[PDB]
Amino acid sequence: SKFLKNRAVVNGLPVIKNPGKYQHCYLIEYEDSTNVKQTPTENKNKQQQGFPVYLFMMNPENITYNLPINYQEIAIPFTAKNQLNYSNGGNIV
């Protein structure tokens, strides 16, 4: 689809360099997202050691992101359209 793709938007996206090895995703405790492995081997007695909570053996084949935005409907009689009132944004699943 490289003949129909909008070149205007593609050229504005950042270019990413291919890394060295096959990367595996993981789950890490939050506020540990910026630490780097203070020790060679996990010491659970201490905290903020920068070790993943769970290491994926195999990367996911696909990842789905869902975001509903909470708007509210007000049905006023004898109106061609309902009133939509913004309620909130919602969490990404």
Partner: peptide, 29 residues
């Protein structure tokens, strides 16, 4: 949404002088 509740209603529509006095004393001054 802001909701309003209004409770309203309709009001219904539409002698010369006294007799006797105690005796006085008058003193010119």
């Amino acid at each position: 949404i802001f909701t309003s509740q209004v409770s309203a209603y309709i009001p219904v529509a539409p002698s010369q002088g006294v007799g006797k006095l105690p005796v006085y004393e008058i003193l010119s001054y």
